[PDB]
Structures are given as structure tokens and as C-alpha cells.
Design a binder for these strands. Structure first.
Ligand SMILES: [Cl-]
Ligand SMILES: [Cl-]
Ligand SMILES: [K+]
Ligand SMILES: [Mg+2]
Ligand SMILES: [Mg+2]
Ligand SMILES: [Mg+2]
Ligand SMILES: [Mg+2]
Ligand SMILES: [Mg+2]
Ligand SMILES: [Mg+2]
Ligand SMILES: [Mg+2]
Ligand SMILES: [Mg+2]
Ligand SMILES: [Mg+2]
Ligand SMILES: [Mg+2]
Ligand SMILES: [Mg+2]
Ligand SMILES: [Mg+2]
Ligand SMILES: [Mg+2]
Ligand SMILES: [Mg+2]
Ligand SMILES: [Mg+2]
Ligand SMILES: [Mg+2]
Ligand SMILES: [Mg+2]
Ligand SMILES: [Mg+2]
Ligand SMILES: [Mg+2]
Ligand SMILES: [Mg+2]
Ligand SMILES: [Mg+2]
Ligand SMILES: [Mg+2]
Ligand SMILES: [Mg+2]
Ligand SMILES: [Mg+2]
Ligand SMILES: [Mg+2]
Ligand SMILES: [Mg+2]
Ligand SMILES: [Mg+2]
Ligand SMILES: [Mg+2]
Ligand SMILES: [Mg+2]
Ligand SMILES: [Mg+2]
Ligand SMILES: [Mg+2]
Ligand SMILES: [Mg+2]
Ligand SMILES: [Mg+2]
Ligand code: NA
Ligand code: NA
Ligand code: NA
Ligand code: NA
Ligand code: NA
Ligand code: NA
Ligand code: NA
Ligand code: NA
Ligand code: NA
Ligand code: NA
Ligand code: NA
Ligand code: NA
Ligand code: NA
Ligand code: NA
Ligand code: NA
Ligand code: NA
Ligand code: NA
Ligand code: NA
Ligand code: NA
Ligand code: NA
Ligand code: NA
Lengths: 53, 132, 337
RNA sequence: CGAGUGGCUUGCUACCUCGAUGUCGGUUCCCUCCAUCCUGCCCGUGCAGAAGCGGGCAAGGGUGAGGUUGUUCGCCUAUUAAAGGAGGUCGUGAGCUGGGUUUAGACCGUCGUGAGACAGGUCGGCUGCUAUCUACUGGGUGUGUAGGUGUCUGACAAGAACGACCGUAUAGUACGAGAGGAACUACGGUUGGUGGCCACUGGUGUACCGGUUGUUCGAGAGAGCACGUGCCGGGUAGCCACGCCACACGGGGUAAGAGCUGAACGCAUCUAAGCUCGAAACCCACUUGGAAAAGAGACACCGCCGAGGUCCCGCGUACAAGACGCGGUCGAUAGACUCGGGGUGUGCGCGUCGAGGUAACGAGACGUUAAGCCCACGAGCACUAACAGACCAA
RNA sequence: GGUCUUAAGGUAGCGUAGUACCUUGCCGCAUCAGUAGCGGCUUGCAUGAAUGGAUUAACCAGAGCUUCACUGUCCCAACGUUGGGCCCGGUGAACUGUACAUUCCAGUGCGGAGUCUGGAGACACCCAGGGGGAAGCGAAGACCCUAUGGA
RNA sequence: GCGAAAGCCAAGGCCUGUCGGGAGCAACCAACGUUAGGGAAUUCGGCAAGUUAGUCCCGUACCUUCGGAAGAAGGGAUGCC
RNA sequence: GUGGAAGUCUGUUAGAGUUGGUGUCCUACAAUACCCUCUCGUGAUCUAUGUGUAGGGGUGAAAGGCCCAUCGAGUCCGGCA
């Protein structure tokens, strides 16, 4: 799997999947990303993110 | 009961106010008890995903309010671990009113449902829109 | 009415004092069933990582599917049975009779013992065989030791010695088997005793935490509500009733917590290998890199990184052995981050 | 109606204390009793089954959460296998709390001429002490057994290390007109308790990095203060639980009870002699402690002019002092350095762009730049420091 | 009862009261469940008019109750910061002390014993701890009664 | 900055609210920070702690002695250049 | 619109007080202290200095409060052994 946020390859047996209100799904590879997301930021504007890269 | 096929961290307590994920006319729920549960001196009875709890209607239609019904925990905010090591958490804590036979009192279930809930409550499941 | 509640902590692991030997001493051995063999082995804890496996459990509705398991890595290099000790039955229990030693000793076994320079192997062997003839021969065990030098991550070189029972078919058949093992050079490996999929009881001296308060040492509550602001926060209500007029040992009190011996039952051996496949990127924290004979034990293992742990074929397993579990993945991701 | 047991209730008595044995309730923490609420085994039944009712053995374990009331008690709710009771100075204030009782202030009602009273109500109203002895929890030093190292034994000691429930198959089966509706056994899980561990999730993280407000160092750069981080954002290790792993069966002897053989008493009889079975209870099993077990242990080797040990030096898998464990050039124990592995999030400067403005000036954007800064971890590496050396010892 | 004591015999109000013994009164509201609270009822053990009655905007570190929000008050505890605590140098008290004292389980005794009696256990010294006991220390008991006491 | 407010800083004064040294510095205690999910279930009682917060615009109930209630409530904005 | 009233409001301005924490202390720093919190803060306000009232007497917005750590009758000495 790939983290739906930064895009790095999520290490098997690792990561959290957040189920949205509407039913949508987002697999985060780390707390750091989940938390960048909760701030309302978009991975594309973070230079450390594989997404941005 | 049947194995949920997952490990749960009860995210709820007696006195907890959750969402009623169905169209029964019941908006909010108040956890009163947890089926089959016996705690320990000073421990607040805890309830989580896939637990059949007893409830009381906090908000909704006048005729539904104050009623002591049974239900099933469909979603929680606290994370739950699946067989592959992943964690799963939802946007809120919600349950669905159920009857003696465990059949949804309602017609439709609003929002997503944890797959695990299927393996215990079919009719509830077979009533679901989205099963995560 | 005062609700009931079970006492805090168990009275089955006491006194709760520091351990005498940092090296574990089993006080029970497996039953003499199958062929002759050493009933134990040791190694040094390294760390933890998970592994993906194929549901092996036949009664599982998931048998056959993926499943992430937590595994503790243990460097289990070879050991050396340097001697065979014999015990004789007596009106006062079992007592050591004599011993059969060798001549080939590990370069650094003298950092612990005063290695034999003159020993009569045959007289010993005779004495034993005459005991057996008389039928006063009690069980038989091998004085063994580890080779810390074989493990770079472990600073010690001074070997850890420990006696381990040899169970086998007939006494005569396993007596011989023992002697054969010793005579060689005593050198044996985890493979010669265990096989992946089997269950083993892992002994070891837990992690020490010096003196700790009852709250942590015994799991008693902290002072609650307003009581917690009055000058007492982590002290128990009382040391007892007016009468009897004495403090009963069963009451939770402060003390030495940790560094106690613990024999953790039914641990599943997920895999016995060799190399650096289990090692993690960056190196196991506060340990190092693994790359030699190792073992993957399911779950956790008492003791802190670098501590010697001891294996033994489970003496009271609950399940049947489901040999060599298929390992589809072992995580090497850094234990940092 | 008659005979009793208990010492939880209440009363009687006035033996003990008035140079003070701190009150009620609660709380916290520990041990116990059985007259047993649940759980195990049984007997009877107005026992078809299921659900009960009554009774017997049994105290191993459990017996929980809430609403009113200071309440004990009790009422009420929803869960529950069940939500049993009692003793321990109505256990527990050199432990807590202080709502009530029971000081001084005050009100109301009743009584009183009045001061003032109440076995009435009400609002307010203080919780001292550095532990000598003993006790226990943990930690050391000596001596005895009578030179050292290593490995054990096991007299005895502790345990609940496990308790219980739900679900599936058995089975819509036995039973039953039907309604309804079991079991043995085999499985999966949960709950409480227990011991341990941190790969994973989660918390901390005043290590660390960034953003930013006020002010000061003239600006810039780089910094100090704002309580022991200004605030906000992120967070490694470690420690942790809300995270993870592990916690039998089976033998042996019994209670109640079910029976065998069997006599006194030709018969009969589970008992008088003998015997087969039979409880979550008892013993063993398993974990943990245990040569100070005075019958003060056993074995192997080393050594008695030398084995081993203390101090010394570098450090922790250890640690309040002490102890413990490891390394010491025949070396990777600590640091430097360089990699690796990680945390932040793109440095200074300079270049271009920039709403505008005559200009001066210009918040900020992009590039250089996964940059800059940083790390309680690992590896490589004798470069630095483990040097020198003292001592005890049959 | 359809007067008598002793003059009159409770009017407006208010009322289960900060006054109501019965009492958790009855009904309602509210809650899963409300000896609380609020409303109605009210025969008020033992309300009521300057012994002031009813009522009432504003005000209040005044007494009771409910909701939203909030949160380590709780479930259930964790980690961290600073000052102690612990070791070292210096300084250096006090409380308390009939004597003896390593106690424990029972018993006995003026009926609440480290010291008596029977047993059990117990090698000596020291460090830290939290305070079970010494009916621990502190105060010639404030309660109660007694004195041909005091104010 | 509304300010004789907070915070920072001069001048001036001081290191004399006068014992020090050492241990990642344990248990326990005093002051305190942060705690996931839940959210008063704690308790005599929400005690303690927390939440809210400055300024401007919009808007504001019952009741009232017309003074008040009222900053009711509720909603929006807030920098730098 | 002006005007700027008030035993008016907010307010750790100064200053006055003392609600809660039943916190810290309780052989104290202190024979009434410390801290946080809180009340008042243009008035029946607070305060310095001077001055008046004396013991069954003062003073008392009244608590039997206060009259030099002494108050249901101050303190000293005497009556008094
Ligand atoms: Cl419940
Ligand atoms: Cl408490
Ligand atoms: K008395
Ligand atoms: Mg990760
Ligand atoms: Mg409780
Ligand atoms: Mg207190
Ligand atoms: Mg990690
Ligand atoms: Mg006492
Ligand atoms: Mg009985
Ligand atoms: Mg018992
Ligand atoms: Mg309660
Ligand atoms: Mg009592
Ligand atoms: Mg009790
Ligand atoms: Mg006291
Ligand atoms: Mg006490
Ligand atoms: Mg005290
Ligand atoms: Mg009181
Ligand atoms: Mg009260
Ligand atoms: Mg009162
Ligand atoms: Mg002697
Ligand atoms: Mg600072
Ligand atoms: Mg009423
Ligand atoms: Mg009232
Ligand atoms: Mg009149
Ligand atoms: Mg004696
Ligand atoms: Mg007296
Ligand atoms: Mg009196
Ligand atoms: Mg008189
Ligand atoms: Mg929280
Ligand atoms: Mg409550
Ligand atoms: Mg408060
Ligand atoms: Mg004013
Ligand atoms: Mg003011
Ligand atoms: Mg004057
Ligand atoms: Mg008076
Ligand atoms: Mg004087
Ligand atoms: Na205190
Ligand atoms: Na305190
Ligand atoms: Na007491
Ligand atoms: Na009796
Ligand atoms: Na009595
Ligand atoms: Na006395
Ligand atoms: Na009490
Ligand atoms: Na029992
Ligand atoms: Na109650
Ligand atoms: Na008490
Ligand atoms: Na007290
Ligand atoms: Na048995
Ligand atoms: Na000995
Ligand atoms: Na009257
Ligand atoms: Na006032
Ligand atoms: Na806290
Ligand atoms: Na004591
Ligand atoms: Na005007
Ligand atoms: Na104050
Ligand atoms: Na006088
Ligand atoms: Na005199």
C-alpha cells in the first residue's frame, strides 16, 4: 500500500486507516502525516512529501 | 459471541452520547449498559465496536425520546486493530437501534459500517449502505 | 456495603527481591518421552520487529490468510556442553554424584571457571555406570555454557554457565547419548533441540526498575478526588487493621521491582535461521546489528536487550505443534521513527 | 408448644478507661467466617423438556456500575453467572475525607414572665507531631557452618494464577400434542484477575527542528527574556497502556452422593471388616523464594606461596548508600571522527518576480535547496581515555 | 355543639415552608433510575399580618436545583519540569525516656498483655520506606456525675 | 497599551530574600506541564482544574420600581505589506 | 447633540478587606505566616500625626466584639500562707 497522504510506501503491519463521515477511506502511514492533514494542509505543499516530490 | 475478527479498544462508557446511524427517528443515543459485560470495582462499564448495548434516546422524535431500546455499536473514534496489524478509526461514535432478534428497528442505515459488525449482526449488515 | 475486588498484584512471585543469578534456573524439565536429547538452550535478546505469516491454525476461520505477528529476535549462536553431571537418588532427594568433563575448552571459559587441567573421565563414567547398575542413578544433565564472543552486540566475553537436563529413551540410552555429546567438544545448536513451529518456555531475569511505589509495584490505586490534593497521592490507605497489631506481609508496599526471574510458558518459535534477515535498518536500538544464528520468538520475552534468555521445550503446552510456519515477510524497517 | 446456637441488632449490668483508648458515614488496603447469592458435585420434586422450587457437600474464585439521601439501611434503573451476608476497637482519622453528630454566630416553629430550652428543622463554622521500640516491605555489613571458582540440591515457604461468561457445531436434535426446547464432547472469542514486553497504535518527550507575538542587542544576520518551554506546530530514544505476548491438562486421596461384595440378624442391608466411583474444595503437577535447613548440604575443578578476591581505571543488561553486572591494549568499555539509521521541513547569501511608489522603499513568491539545523541509537574506527599500581589471601 | 376555659376564636395572604411529627405525603415535570429541585394539592404535629403578611425589579465571595460549554473530578493511570528526598563537607537542635525489650499465635489477668502461662518463631549490626501496634506523643476530659466550688 | 496594567529594557541598585558538593538525580512529597477515547460516570457538592477572554460591527428574551435586565444570548471581524 | 450625575459599573492604580482552595506551614519565616483565588476601590471611603473616653467602667452599624499576644468583666501589686 501507499499512504494516501504523502505517498510513501506504507510498511506492512503499519499505518492507520481513517474512515470519513461520507464513507471515504484514507490510509495514513504515520501520525506525522495524519497530523499535518488535521491542520488542513495538503501533502502537495509540503516539500518533504513524496507527493510534493 | 462470535469473534469480531479484530481487537477493540472500547471507546465508550455508560453515560456516553453517540449518534443513531439509522432513520428510526432517533438522533442521539445514551449508553446505559453493555450486554454481557461485568466490570470491576470503580470501573465505568465500557462499550465499543460490535457491542450490543442498551440505550436511551437523548434526542429525536417526541415518541422516540426517553425510550429504553437495545442497539449495536457500528462506529467509534477510538482505533481498532485488524489481523494485518493496521488500525482503523472512524469519524464518530454511532450505533444502530436493534430489536429482540437483532434486526434493525429502522429501514436504512446512515453512514459507513465496520465490516466486522457483519460477522455478528447479519440483518444489520445486510441493511448497510457502505461497509468499510 | 464496600464492593468486593481482587487483591492487587499476585502473591505467587515472591518475595519480590532482586534475583540471585542474572542467568535463569529452570526448576522443572520436560517429560522423558521421545529420543535422548538436551532439554534446553540459550541466547541473547536483541530486539523486536514483526513478521507476516500464513494463518497456520486449523481451527481458525482465517487459516491460510496473512497475519502480522510481533517477534522478538534472539541471537542463539552455538553453545557447548562441557560436562555431564550425574545425580543419585537419596533419602534426601537428588544429589550430584560426579561429573564427566572434556579437554577441549573455549579459549575464554577461564574467565568464569578454573578450567580442569587434570580430570579422570573414565573413573567418573565408571562411578555413574556402577550407580545405574545399583539403580541409584537419578536424572542426567549437562553443564553447558555460551560463547558471548560469538555475539558482537554483547560486550561480555565471560561465558554464562548453566546446567540443563538430558531426557531420552532409556536411562542407559540417554546416558550414552550425553557422553557422546560431551566427548566431542560439547558443541550443539538450537536446531539440534528445537524446530520452528514448536512451543518453548523462555526464562530470564526481567528488566530492573530499582525501588518503585506500590502503585506501580503492585497496581494499587492512586489517591482519587480531593484525597489526591491533600498530601497523599501514591500511598495506600492503611497498612492494615488495628488488630492484628502488626503489618501483614501481604500488604502492598514499596520495594525492589524488576530484575526478577520469570519463566514465560508456551512461547511459539516462529523461525530458527541465520544471517541478517531479521536485523532492522539503523541497527536494533541500544543493541546493534544481527547476523548469525538466531531465533524468532512470537510475542515478548522477559529481560532487556543483551540479557541471556533460556529456552526449554514447553512443559505444559496447550496446543499441538504446527511445524515450520510460512513466513511471507519480515519487517526490516528502522526501530527509530 | 417445647429445646437450643450465635454474639450482626436492641436492652440490661456498671467490671475496665474521665492526669482523654479521637465521633457517625465513606474511602483506601489487608486477613478471616459460613448460616452459600453465583460458580463445581450431588438428592428430592406437585422432576417430560426448558425454566424452576426445596435440600446436601463445598468458602477455590467472584459478588460489579449508577439516580435521590451525610446516611448505615433502604428505594429506584440498567447490566449481570450472581450482582450473599458477617468478624477484624460497629478493622482501617501518628491514612484520607469532614457531608452528619456535638462549641462559640444566626434564623424559623413549639414552650417559657424571663434568661433560655428542644431526643425539632436550618445556613455558617479548625483536623497537631521530625518514628525511640516493635511490625512488615525492600536493600546492605559481619559472624557461624570451616582456602577459592563454578554448578546444584531442597527441608520448607508463597500463589487464584487462574476465575467466569458468551458464541458455533452437537440441533431446531433428545423430550414434547404443540408451543417450546437441552446435553456429553470439540472448537472460537470476551471479561476479570495474573506475570512480562514496546515491532505495532496511543501518551509523554521544558532532547530536538520549525512558525510567530512583545521587547532588547542600531538594521540585517544571530540571539536573551516573557517561570523555570512566551505561545502554537511537529517529534527520536526511553518510560509507559488506551498497545502487544504468555497464564493447562492430567494424575492421587476425599465430602455430599451413586454403587459393589458383606455380616452381626440364614433373609435383607452402600458399612460394621473390605472395595469401586465421586466436588471449582484437598495433595501432586506448574511458577517464585529458598544452605542460617545448627543434621548449617551435594558435585567438579583450581589452589595452600599462591587459587581467587578487594582497591584501581573505562562503563552499565544494575543501582537511593551498599549491592550487582561488564570491559580494561592478548582491547571495541566510553568519547572524538566518518558513515548508517532517525526528527524537523527547505538555512545564510545571492538571483528573478512582487501589489504598488518619481524615488527611497516593499510584506511576500520561486530558484539555488529532500536544503539548513539536530539526535539519549547502531557500525567502522585504537585517534583520545581503560594508564600506573596497591592490597588481602590458607 | 347547630356555648366552655380565659378576652377574642385566625380575616387578606401564604402553606409538606430555612415553620410539616406522620414523610421519601399525593399528583405532575425532569432522569434509564431524582429521600434532591421546581409546580399543583394541602385538614398547617406546631403559618399569618410592623412578634409585620404577601409580594417583588436591581444587588450578592449568601443557601438548594437544572441546561450548554468545558475539563485528568472519574474510567486509569502515564510521562515530563522545578525544589526536596538519597550520598559527601560544614553547622546542628527538639519532642520523648520506671525498668527490661528479636517477637508471633493462643490463653490468663481489674473483663483491651513485647514482660504472666503454654507453645511457635528468633545469628548480630546497619540503610531506606510507608506508618499496623506500643489502648504511640502532645493537653490533671471540654461530655457526664459529685463539691453544702466559681463566675 | 486604555492604563500608575502585563511583558521587555534604561538610569540607579544588587548577586546578602546568603551554606555548599555529587548521583539522568530511584520510591515518596511540594509546585506544575501534557495526556488518547469517553466527558461529572468522581463527589455531600464540579471541590480543584478547566472553558471564555482584549477591540469593532451586527444583533439581543422573560421580567422591571422604566433606572435596569445588557457585555443578555447569538453571529461576524481582527496580522503584515 | 451637549452635559457629566452616581454610598454606579469593570479594574492586583494606590490602597483597604479576607470568599474558596478546608492547598503550603503546623518543634513555622510567623504565639495568626505563604501562595493562588476572591470583595471594595468618589465614599456610611482609606490613612498618618495629634487629641478625648478607664475597669462593673469605656467603646461597641451588637460578634458579649474590643480596651497593648490578657476580656461573660484588662493588667499590676496588695488582702494572701
Ligand atoms: Cl451498567
Ligand atoms: Cl483515595
Ligand atoms: K474516659
Ligand atoms: Mg512508523
Ligand atoms: Mg467507588
Ligand atoms: Mg487536608
Ligand atoms: Mg520505535
Ligand atoms: Mg490511638
Ligand atoms: Mg455448610
Ligand atoms: Mg478464602
Ligand atoms: Mg457515585
Ligand atoms: Mg470502627
Ligand atoms: Mg469493612
Ligand atoms: Mg488525626
Ligand atoms: Mg490510625
Ligand atoms: Mg502525622
Ligand atoms: Mg460539617
Ligand atoms: Mg450542610
Ligand atoms: Mg451545618
Ligand atoms: Mg556462635
Ligand atoms: Mg525560558
Ligand atoms: Mg412540593
Ligand atoms: Mg426549602
Ligand atoms: Mg395587628
Ligand atoms: Mg514464652
Ligand atoms: Mg480531670
Ligand atoms: Mg456542660
Ligand atoms: Mg454562683
Ligand atoms: Mg483526555
Ligand atoms: Mg454522581
Ligand atoms: Mg473553582
Ligand atoms: Mg462603587
Ligand atoms: Mg472594583
Ligand atoms: Mg488617631
Ligand atoms: Mg451569644
Ligand atoms: Mg502587658
Ligand atoms: Na498535607
Ligand atoms: Na497538596
Ligand atoms: Na486507630
Ligand atoms: Na445463646
Ligand atoms: Na450487647
Ligand atoms: Na488515663
Ligand atoms: Na470512618
Ligand atoms: Na468460596
Ligand atoms: Na444509593
Ligand atoms: Na472517620
Ligand atoms: Na483528622
Ligand atoms: Na479428583
Ligand atoms: Na552454610
Ligand atoms: Na400568631
Ligand atoms: Na457584601
Ligand atoms: Na495533570
Ligand atoms: Na506505627
Ligand atoms: Na441630555
Ligand atoms: Na487570601
Ligand atoms: Na474590672
Ligand atoms: Na494576694
Amino acid at each position: 500500500r501507499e499512504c494516501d497522504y504523502c505517498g510513501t510506501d506504507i510498511e506492512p503491519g503499519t499505518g492507520t486507516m481513517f474512515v470519513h463521515k461520507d464513507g471515504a477511506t484514507t490510509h495514513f502511514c504515520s501520525s506525522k502525516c495524519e497530523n499535518n492533514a488535521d491542520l488542513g494542509r495538503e501533502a502537495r505543499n509540503l516539500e518533504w512529501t513524496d507527493t510534493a516530490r | 459471541m462470535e469473534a469480531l475478527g479484530a481487537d477493540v479498544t472500547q471507546g465508550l462508557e455508560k453515560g456516553s452520547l453517540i449518534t443513531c446511524a439509522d432513520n428510526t427517528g432517533a438522533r442521539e443515543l445514551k449508553v446505559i449498559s453493555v450486554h454481557g459485560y461485568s466490570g470491576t470495582k470503580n470501573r465505568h462499564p465500557k462499550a465499543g465496536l460490535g457491542d450490543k448495548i442498551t440505550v436511551s434516546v437523548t434526542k429525536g422524535t417526541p415518541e422516540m425520546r426517553r425510550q429504553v431500546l437495545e442497539a449495536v455499536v457500528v462506529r467509534q473514534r477510538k482505533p481498532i486493530r485488524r489481523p494485518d496489524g493496521t488500525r482503523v478509526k472512524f469519524e464518530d461514535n454511532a450505533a444502530v437501534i436493534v430489536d429482540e432478534n437483532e434486526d434493525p428497528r429502522g429501514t436504512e442505515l446512515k453512514g459507513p459500517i465496520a465490516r466486522e459488525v457483519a460477522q455478528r449482526f447479519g440483518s444489520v449488515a445486510s441493511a448497510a449502505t457502505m461497509i468499510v | 456495603p464496600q464492593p468486593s475486588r481482587p487483591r492487587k498484584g499476585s502473591l505467587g512471585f515472591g518475595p519480590r527481591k532482586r534475583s540471585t543469578s542474572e542467568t535463569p534456573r529452570f526448576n522443572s524439565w520436560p517429560s522423558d518421552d521421545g529420543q535422548p536429547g538436551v532439554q534446553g538452550f540459550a541466547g541473547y535478546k536483541a530486539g523486536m520487529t514483526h513478521v507476516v505469516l500464513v494463518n497456520d491454525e486449523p481451527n481458525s476461520p482465517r487459516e491460510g490468510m496473512e497475519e502480522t505477528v510481533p517477534v522478538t529476535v534472539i541471537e542463539t549462536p552455538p553453545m557447548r556442553a562441557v560436562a555431564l553431571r550425574a545425580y543419585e537418588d537419596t533419602p534426601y532427594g537428588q544429589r550430584p554424584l560426579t561429573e564427566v568433563w572434556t579437554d577441549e575448552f573455549h579459549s575464554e571459559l577461564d574467565r568464569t571457571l578454573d578450567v580442569p587441567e587434570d580430570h579422570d573421565p573414565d573413573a567418573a563414567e565408571e562411578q555413574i555406570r556402577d550407580a545405574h547398575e545399583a539403580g541409584d542413578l537419578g536424572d542426567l544433565r549437562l553443564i553447558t555454557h555460551t560463547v558471548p564472543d560469538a555475539v558482537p552486540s554483547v560486550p561480555k566475553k565471560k561465558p554464562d554457565v548453566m546446567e540443563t537436563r538430558v531426557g531420552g529413551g532409556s536411562v542407559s540410552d540417554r546416558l550414552d547419548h550425553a557422553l557422546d555429546i560431551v566427548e566431542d567438544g560439547g558443541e550443539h545448536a538450537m536446531n539440534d533441540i528445537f524446530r520452528a513451529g514448536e512451543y518453548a518456555d523462555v526464562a530470564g531475569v526481567t528488566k530492573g526498575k530499582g525501588t518503585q511505589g506500590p502503585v506501580k509495584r503492585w497496581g494499587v490505586q492512586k489517591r482519587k478526588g480531593k484525597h489526591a490534593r491533600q498530601g497523599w497521592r501514591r500511598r495506600i490507605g492503611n497498612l492494615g487493621p488495628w488488630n492484628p497489631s502488626r503489618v501483614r506481609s501481604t500488604v502492598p508496599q514499596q520495594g525492589q521491582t524488576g530484575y526478577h526471574q520469570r519463566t514465560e510458558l508456551n512461547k511459539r518459535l516462529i523461525d530458527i535461521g541465520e544471517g541478517d534477515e531479521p536485523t532492522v535498518d539503523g541497527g536494533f536500538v541500544n543493541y546493534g546489528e544481527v547476523d548469525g544464528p538466531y531465533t524468532l520468538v512470537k510475542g515478548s520475552v522477559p529481560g532487556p536487550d543483551k540479557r541471556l534468555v533460556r529456552f526449554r521445550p514447553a512443559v505444559r503446552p496447550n496446543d499441538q505443534p504446527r511445524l515450520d510456519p510460512e513466513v511471507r515477510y519480515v519487517s526490516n524497517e528502522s526501530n527509530q521513527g
